[PDB]
Amino acid sequence: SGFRKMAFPSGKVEGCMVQVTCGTTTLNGLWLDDVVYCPRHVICTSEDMLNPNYEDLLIRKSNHNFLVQAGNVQLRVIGHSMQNCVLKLKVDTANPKTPKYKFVRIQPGQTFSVLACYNGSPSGVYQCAMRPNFTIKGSFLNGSCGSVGFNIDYDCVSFCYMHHMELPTGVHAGTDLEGNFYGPFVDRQTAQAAGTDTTITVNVLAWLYAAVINGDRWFLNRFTTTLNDFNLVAMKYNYEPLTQDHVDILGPLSAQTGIAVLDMCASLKELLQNGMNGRTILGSALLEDEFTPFDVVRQCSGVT
């Protein structure tokens, strides 16, 4: 028992982190096979970032300008191309530690682990969620750009995120591994405000199931609700509307605990309308929304 915010083991991704330098700028790169992926803003100067024309700035760069270092050994760059907002630096050596991998584009509500790196060196690992406004609440300093978000399915790493920007409100923006930003964010230093940060309703319900499974049951009540009734309450509190897909996705947890999804919705409805009353659920004083139903199932069963 016990339920914790748990990141995937980072070993497989640590073996992929390299340091990329272009001029005065040093950020991280992901080394898979003979390609190093990194944010294209590595070629910008602090002046360029205000309004950069990346195709133009890239014409001024050659293979030898991209300094790629894996630990203390330098990698030879034999090609360079821009794919959307990432650079793909072809190296002469395939990464011997390349795990089995996929590049996936996740949806908001989906969670992943971030291996925070600086100078191609990993510093820590934490669990994030792609927020419904396509931002992530990360922990990234200068030098952390190029750090990746991933999920692991047994031995295959599904890379979903690469860090690019910090919005002036402290939230983070980045791309999938094809260089397409999540949401409307651009790799430009401009006025990009994040939209409403809605709460991931299905994730809160999943975490309520995790709590019942681990002994925290005080919030269970004698009520039920409907999807439409619950949604009126979810609307009021800036929660994602609950769909029959989310109800179906919650099925395995409903089955295991014996609590119908709509009854758990009525518990969540009461928690929204009345607060926690100074109580906690899984050691938290607010409704946690960065555990998916799959994360709850994984942790509650011990998937490796």
Place this chain on the structure above:
Amino acid sequence: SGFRKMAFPSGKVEGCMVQVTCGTTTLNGLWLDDVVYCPRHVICTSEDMLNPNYEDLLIRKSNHNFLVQAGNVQLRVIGHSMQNCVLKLKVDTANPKTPKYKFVRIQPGQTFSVLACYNGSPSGVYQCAMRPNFTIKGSFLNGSCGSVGFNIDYDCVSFCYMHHMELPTGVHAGTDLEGNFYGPFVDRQTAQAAGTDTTITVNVLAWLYAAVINGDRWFLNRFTTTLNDFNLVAMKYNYEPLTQDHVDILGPLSAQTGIAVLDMCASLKELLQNGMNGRTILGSALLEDEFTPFDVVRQCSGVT
């Protein structure tokens, strides 16, 4: 910017996890050099655990009874000995992936990362603290025993914890790597209740500094306090008494932010006496105490 509960990169420790089986029981073992460390309760049957005489149960076991498997390759056991509550299985092969390491016994308030494993396979990584009552709030299922807690100082892993028990209240107990349990817990299925779970005051103050550094400043007030006055309030709310050592330990953070430690104590005093008033600090609705001043400094600067 952004502050997250961050675990150390788990790569170095993943390469040490092995599966240990003794009879019907399968748990995890730590493979460093030619020794595999595992909880001594691996030799118990569910009947034995009520009142086990480990020296007696161990006489019935030989080197060939300890089945040690690293991935799909079996390790030959050439020796076995009991050190306090852990078994040390000498193998014929030194772990090629043995990182630089230390075995350290941490104090309560100190934090570490747990690589949760099942059948010698890592499932996830999360950050814990050794609670002042010598328990940890982990996430461990059956099969997770033998999972370790660690800290990393550049390339040296300091192993501090090995999982052994789950108390009937959902909290966890284990040993350092010399087999000595933290606190008064024993590897016996008996009535072991955890003591008062006091809040790690110095860690809360450190996390308040992390919050100011990242933009959350609403809780800052026009008050100050003394160590003795603050301690009257800390006593009332089951907080650890603040010492001049903790004030000194907070020095670097006080210096960086310009907020005197005692002024931050007065902010913490007001938060204790008045609550958060439905507000949050670093995305949390309660006072976080599992970030040490060193963790705040590390994350706020990007130590790899």
